Design a protein around this ligand. Structure first.
Ligand SMILES: NC(=O)c1cc[n+](COC[n+]2ccccc2/C=N/O)cc1
Ligand SMILES: NC(=O)c1cc[n+](COC[n+]2ccccc2/C=N/O)cc1
Ligand SMILES: *[C@@H]1O[C@H](CO)[C@@H](O)[C@H](O)[C@H]1NC(C)=O
Ligand SMILES: *[C@@H]1O[C@H](CO)[C@@H](O)[C@H](O)[C@H]1NC(C)=O
Ligand SMILES: *[C@@H]1O[C@H](CO)[C@@H](O)[C@H](O)[C@H]1NC(C)=O
Lengths: 533, 535
C-alpha cells in the first residue's frame, strides 16, 4: 500500500491511484462520492451530503456520467465523439475527482476547480480533454472536477414547488465546492485559495456562483471561458421553465406534486427522448433545461445582478475563441455541414439568422442581416457563411462576454480578457470552422505535453505558456509571471481602454475593444428594437 | 449698329441682342448676359407658371447680369468671404427670369456641345450671376457654349396649394424648363448644338437636374446630366402635397392671409414679408431642411422621386454624379449648438445627441438612437474630436452621400451609364476652418476653372487640377464619357455598376479607383432607417 495514495476525508478513507504524466507521477483520486445518489424520489431534488462509509473506498477510476442525451450526428467522428460520455450513463453520478502532485504538496497549494460545459444537457468530468494530471505535475496544482446533473435531471423546474425547485444541477456544483472547503486540505490543497474555471455552460455556471451569495464563501477567483451567466441561452424565467416542464410532462403522459411524482416514475431515457421537443422555436445554441431565475439561487436576472453587484474583492479571467459560432451551424442550419465548404446563398443566410436568433422579430432579424451583410459583396457565399458563424458566436458568446467584462470592471472587479486564436494541428473539423468553440481547452489542460498525442513542438510550448497564465492567475489573481521581466504584460481589462490579449503561437499582443461596434448593436440596440418589437 | 463689334450682334426668337467681349486668361470670349426668357412673374403672375417672354423691339443690351430672384440673404458671418460669395450680387427683384450665355470668340463655326448650369442654394436662394458660376473659362479653354438661368426660389418658386390653378407648385422648375426650351430654339444662333445638351448643377441645382430626368416633358430638352452633391431622392429635395399645403397655409397665416382667396391675399403681400417668414414654417428645429421646395404634385412629378427612380427605364441616359469629402460640415454652424467657424467645435456627447435630433429632424426616438449607436466610436464614446466629425458625417451621409449612392445604384440597375466621383481637394484659398475639411460647394470653383485666373491666387497645381476637371466635364458633355480617347496612359474612369460600385477620387494625384460609396453606412440609411421609422 502506497501511503501517498491513501487519504482520510470527513466521510472516511479513500485509495487513489498513481498516474504517469510526461514529467513524473501524479496522485489521482477519481470517483469520490460527494452526494447521496439523486435517484428514485430524490430525482429533481437538491443534493444531500454523502453518508460516511466504512473501510477504504476505491477511488482509482472515474465514476458514471450523469444521464444525458448522446450526440449521434456524425457516428464515430472524433470531433463529436470526444464530447460524448466515455463511461456508463447513470442518474447515480454525483462524484468528483482530485489530482495532486506526487508526493503530495508539502505546503497548502492553490486549488483549481473545473466545471465542464455541454449546454447544461450534457458533459462529464471524465473526458480526456479535462485530464488534470498535466496541471498537477507541471504546475504543482491541486485540480478538482465534479459531475453535476444535466438536462431535466439537473434543471427541470416547477418554480415554487417543493420537489422540483430548479437549479439542482448548480446545487450539485455548490455541494462539491463545500466538499473542497472541508476536505481539500487532506490532499494538500489550500481551501483559502480556490479558483473556479469552466467553459461554455461551465463558464455560465461559474458566473452563477459569482452571482449567488451562498457560493461566494466557497472560492476566491474565477475564469469564464467562452460563456457567461448573462446572455440569451444560460437562463430562463420562472414562467418559461414552468412551461417547458409542464410540456415535457404532457409529452411523457403525466398539483405540482402529482406532476412531479409522475415524472419520477419515468425511466431516464423517456425524459431524454422528449427533452429537445420543448423549445419554443427552431433554434441553435438554445437548450431546454437550464438554470432558472428562481428568486432563490438567482435573486434576479443575471443582467440585473451584474449591473448592481459589488465585485470589488473579485478577480476574473474571461475570454472567447476566434470562431465561437462555427460548430453550431451544422446542428440545425440548412446549408451547413462539416463535409463540404458550406458555401451558402443569401436566402439561406436570412433563414440561418431566424434560427440563430430565434427570439427576433422580423425587424430585429432584418437589423441583424443588414449589419452582417457585406454590402460590397452582398451575395458572396464565403462572406455569407462566415457572417452566419459570426452572428451565432457574437450573439451567444462574444458580446455577452464583452458585456460581463465591462460590468465587472465598472463595479470594482479586477478583470483580464483574451481571444484564443490558435487552431489545433490535430483538429478534425474542416478548415472553414476556423478556431472552433471548445478547442482551447486541450491547451489549457496541457494535453500537448503528452508526446503520444501528436501535437507540434510549438504547440507544446504554447500549452506550457497557457498553463502558466491560468495557474499564475489561480495563485495571485494575475496571469502575469511574478518574476520575468521581458514583456509584453497582459493588462487588466477596463471600461476606459478595453484592453485584451491574443493567445496564439506568437508573443502576447494587446488589442483594444472586443468587437466594440458590433457588440454595441447586440448589447445596446437589439434590446430596444425588440421591446419596440 | 455701324461701329459695334460684328461678333457681338445676335438675333433670337424674341429679337436682337448685343453681347459683350470678355477677357479670359487665354483670350477673349463672348458673353450675352441678362437675356429675358419669360414675362416678368410679378403682380398677378406671382406663384404662377412662367409665360414665354414676348418679342421686344430694337437691340436688347445683353452686357450685364440681370436682377437676382427675391430671396433670404445670409447674415450669420457679416463680411466673411465664406458666406458672402454665395449671397446675391445684383438687385433682388421678382422680375428676375433671365439667362446668360458664354461662347468662344469669335463664335464657333460648327455646332458646339452645350452645358447648362442650374445653381443650388436649398431652393430658397442662389443666382446664375455669382463669380463661382462664371462660364468664361469653360468657353475659352474648352470651346464650350455655356448657359445659366435664374429661376424663382423660396415662396415665389415653390409655395404650393396642390390642386389649385393659381399656385400649382414647382414653378421654379418650370422656370428652368422654359430656359431649356429657349436653348432648344435659340442656342444655334450662338454656335451651340441643341442636339447635344448636358445639364449640370450642384446641391438643389443637382436635385433640379434629377427632377428633369424624372419629368417626361423635360426629357426631350437635354441628352446627358451631371449631379454634383445633390439628388431628387432623399430627405430635403421634395415634400408631399400634404406638407406643402400645410406650409403654404401656415405662411399665409403668418403674414395676415378657399385657395383662390388665400392665394389672392398672398399676392398683395410685399415680397420681403414672404421672405421674412418663410423659415418659420418648418415642422421641427433642423438643418439641411428648406421651407419651400419641389412638391410631389402628381404632375411635374408623377410620383415620389424614390418610386420614379425605382421603376424608371434609364437606358438612353448617361449620368455623372458625385460628392465632396465633407458634405455635412458647413451645415453644422447654421444651427447645431457647439459648432462654429471660429473655434475647433469639439463637442460633448450631449451635444452630439442633440445635434442628431436636429440633423435628422424626422426621426423617432428609436431611429435617433440607431443613428447615435451607429456613429458612436465605442472605444472612445466621449471623445470630442470624434463626436464633432461624426456629427458632420451624419449630416453629410443622410442628406447627400447616401441619396447619391442610392441614385447611382438605381440608375445603373435600370440601364443608365453612370460615372461617380468623390472630390477630395480643399482649396488653398478656403476661408472656412480646417476641421470643416473639403466642404459642400467647394468643388464648383474648380469645375468652372476659376483657378486659371492668375489674380485669384490658387497654386500652380490647382491650376492644372482645374484643367483636368474641366476636361472630364466637357468630355462627358461631348460624348457621355469623362475619359479622353486620345490618352490611354492616364488612369481610366470606369462606370459605376451595381456589381463593382466603382468611383474615382478627384484630387491633385492621378485618378484612383475605389469601390463602394460608404456601402455599409449607406445600407443603414437607405435600407434600414425607412423600416425603423415605420415601426
Ligand atoms: C453540440 O454538442 C457538441 N459539444 C457539446 C459539449 C461541449 C462541446 C461540444 C463541441 N465542442 O466543440
Ligand atoms: C448657405 O448657403 C450657401 N450656399 C448656397 C448654395 C450652394 C452652396 C452654398 C454654401 N456652400 O458652402
Ligand atoms: C454541404 O452539405 C449539406 C448537407 O448535405 C448540403 O445541404 C449542402 O448543399 C452542401 N453544400 C452547400 C452549401 O451547397
Ligand atoms: C465655439 O463657438 C461657439 C459659439 O461661440 C460655442 O457655442 C462653442 O461652445 C465653442 N466651442 C468651444 C469648445 O469653444
Ligand atoms: C492675392 O494675392 C495678393 C498678394 O498678396 C493679395 O494682395 C490679394 O489680396 C490676393 N487676392 C485674393 C483674392 O485674396
Amino acid at each position: 500500500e502506497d501511503p501517498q495514495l491513501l487519504v482520510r476525508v470527513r466521510g472516511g478513507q479513500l485509495r487513489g491511484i498513481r498516474l504517469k504524466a510526461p514529467g513524473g507521477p501524479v496522485s489521482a483520486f477519481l470517483g469520490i462520492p460527494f452526494a447521496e445518489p439523486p435517484v428514485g424520489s430524490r430525482r429533481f431534488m437538491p443534493p444531500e451530503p454523502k453518508r460516511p462509509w466504512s473501510g477504504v473506498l476505491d477511488a482509482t477510476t472515474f465514476q458514471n456520467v450523469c444521464y444525458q442525451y448522446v450526440d449521434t450526428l456524425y457516428p464515430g467522428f472524433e470531433g463529436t465523439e470526444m464530447w460524448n460520455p466515455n463511461r456508463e450513463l447513470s442518474e447515480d453520478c454525483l462524484y468528483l475527482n482530485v489530482w495532486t502532485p506526487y508526493p503530495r504538496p508539502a505546503s497548502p497549494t492553490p486549488v483549481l476547480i473545473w466545471i465542464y460545459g455541454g449546454g447544461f444537457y450534457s458533459g462529464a468530468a471524465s473526458l480526456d480533454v479535462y485530464d488534470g494530471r498535466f496541471l498537477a505535475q507541471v504546475e504543482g496544482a491541486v485540480l478538482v472536477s465534479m459531475n453535476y446533473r444535466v438536462g431535466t435531471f439537473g434543471f427541470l423546474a416547477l418554480p415554487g414547488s417543493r420537489e422540483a425547485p430548479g437549479n439542482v444541477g448548480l446545487l450539485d456544483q455548490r455541494l462539491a465546492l463545500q466538499w473542497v472547503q472541508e476536505n481539500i486540505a487532506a490532499f494538500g490543497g489550500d481551501p483559502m485559495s480556490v479558483t473556479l474555471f469552466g467553459e461554455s455552460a461551465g463558464a455560465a455556471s461559474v458566473g452563477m456562483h459569482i452571482l449567488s451569495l451562498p457560493s461566494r464563501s466557497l472560492f476566491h477567483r474565477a475564469v469564464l471561458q467562452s460563456g457567461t451567466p448573462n446572455g440569451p441561452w444560460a437562463t430562463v424565467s420562472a414562467g418559461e421553465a414552468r412551461r417547458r416542464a409542464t410540456l415535457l410532462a404532457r409529452l411523457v403522459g403525466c398539483n405540482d406534486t402529482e406532476l412531479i411524482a409522475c415524472l419520477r416514475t419515468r425511466p431516464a431515457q423517456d425524459l431524454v427522448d422528449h427533452e429537445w421537443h420543448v423549445l419554443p422555436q427552431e433554434s441553435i445554441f438554445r437548450f431546454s433545461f437550464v438554470p432558472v431565475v428562481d428568486g432563490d439561487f438567482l435573486s434576479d436576472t443575471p443582467e440585473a445582478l451584474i449591473n448592481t453587484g459589488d465585485f470589488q474583492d473579485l478577480q476574473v479571467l474571461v475570454g472567447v475563441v476566434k470562431d465561437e459560432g462555427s460548430y453550431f451551424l451544422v446542428y440545425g442550419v440548412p446549408g451547413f455541414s462539416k463535409d463540404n465548404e458550406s458555401l451558402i446563398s443569401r436566402a439561406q443566410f436570412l433563414a440561418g439568422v431566424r434560427i440563430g436568433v430565434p427570439q427576433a422579430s422580423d425587424l430585429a432579424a432584418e437589423a441583424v442581416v443588414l449589419h452582417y451583410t457585406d454590402w460590397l459583396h452582398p451575395e458572396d457565399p464565403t462572406h455569407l457563411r462566415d457572417a452566419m458563424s459570426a452572428v451565432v458566436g457574437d450573439h451567444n458568446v462574444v458580446c455577452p462576454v464583452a458585456q460581463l467584462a465591462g460590468r465587472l470592471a465598472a463595479q470594482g472587479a479586477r478583470v483580464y480578457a483574451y481571444i484564443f486564436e490558435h487552431r489545433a494541428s490535430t483538429l478534425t473539423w474542416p478548415l472553414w470552422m476556423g478556431v472552433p468553440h471548445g478547442y482551447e481547452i486541450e491547451f489549457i489542460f496541457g494535453l500537448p505535453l503528452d508526446p503520444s498525442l501528436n501535437y507540434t513542438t510549438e504547440e507544446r510550448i504554447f500549452a506550457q505558456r497557457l498553463m502558466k497564465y491560468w495557474t499564475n492567475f489561480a495563485r495571485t489573481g494575475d496571469p502575469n509571471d511574478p518574476r520575468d521581466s521581458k514583456s509584453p504584460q497582459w493588462p487588466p481589462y477596463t471600461t476606459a481602454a478595453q484592453q485584451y490579449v491574443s493567445l496564439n503561437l506568437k508573443p502576447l499582443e494587446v488589442r483594444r475593444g472586443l468587437r466594440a461596434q458590433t457588440c454595441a448593436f447586440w448589447n445596446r440596440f437589439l434590446p430596444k428594437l425588440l421591446s419596440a418589437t
